[PDB]
């Protein structure tokens, strides 16, 4: 009948080395946003945004991912 | 009949290593936001969003991950 | 009949190692704001946010994550 | 007669181990300085100095000094 | 008669060992100066500076030093 | 009669290690400096400066130094 066997081995290495990481600088809407409105008109939903919004500065030293899925389906 | 077995063996590494990891500057929204409004008219909803708004600054000294499934389905 | 064997082992690890992490600088909304408004009307739900909201500084020293999922199902 | 001998035998260490060095901020600045003058006289020389100068962020991984004199004198 | 014999011997060692260094930061800066004047008179030389002067960064990895005189001096 | 003897021995050693070295910021500068001057009178040599002067940023990898003075003086 059946035998089934499922033995996978994983010595891997993600890895990274970095002297020094620095000296970023993120400057978004440095500028002038003016916004003049007359006279508008609106009948369904509204949504806005005006100004500096949802900006990242993401600066992980390392940031290394590994991602790994493993599946035994029998019927 | 049957026999099923499952050892998968994990002995991995995500790593990171960083000397020094500094001087980062978000400056989001440094500019001037003027918004005049004059005979609007809204029949629904409304969201507003007017400035600095969910700016973010994420420096995290490792930021690794690892993300392993393991399943084992049998009908 | 069934027999069924579930041993993954697993040695990993998820490492980070910065010497220093710092001077970060998060400056959000700057900047001035002026909202202006006459002769607006609402006939549903507003919501309005003006400023420096929600801004985050997230500076975690590890910052690392495992996740690990096991599922064994039988029917 | 006279006989004089200088043997002086040093094997001395200064040793510094320092693991990481980091995070400094030295700010002498953002200053306001105003200086108003009128009818004033000098006769002898003048030396004059207005605002930042002369400021030091000094910071040597080691430092370390050793200063040895040695003198043999004869009349 | 005389017999005069300098034989200083050295085997001194000045060491440093440093992992990482960073993250510096120095502001002489972003001042307002002003300087007004009238009706002055002088008679003898005039030495003047006004502003961001002379101001250092040294950040030297070893930054060590030995400094070693001898002198034998016969009269 | 007279006999001199000068051997001095020197094995010393000035030595660094350093890992990594950075992320530096030196900033002597962004200033406003004003300088407004009626009805001055100079009769000596008059020497000025106004404004960002000399200002260094220094990073030597090593930055070691060894001075040796020998003197032998003899009347």
Chains 1, 2, 3, 4, 5, 6 share one sequence.
Request: one cysteine or more.
């Amino acid at each position: 009948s059946v035998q089934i066997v499922y033995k996978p081995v994983d010595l891997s290495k993600v890895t990274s080395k970095c002297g020094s990481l620095g000296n970023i600088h993120h400057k978004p809407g440095g500028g002038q946003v003016e916004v003049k409105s007359e006279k508008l008109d609106f009948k369904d939903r509204v949504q806005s945004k005006i100004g500096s919004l949802d900006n990242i500065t993401h600066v992980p030293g390392g940031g290394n991912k590994k991602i790994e899925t493993h599946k035994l389906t029998f019927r």
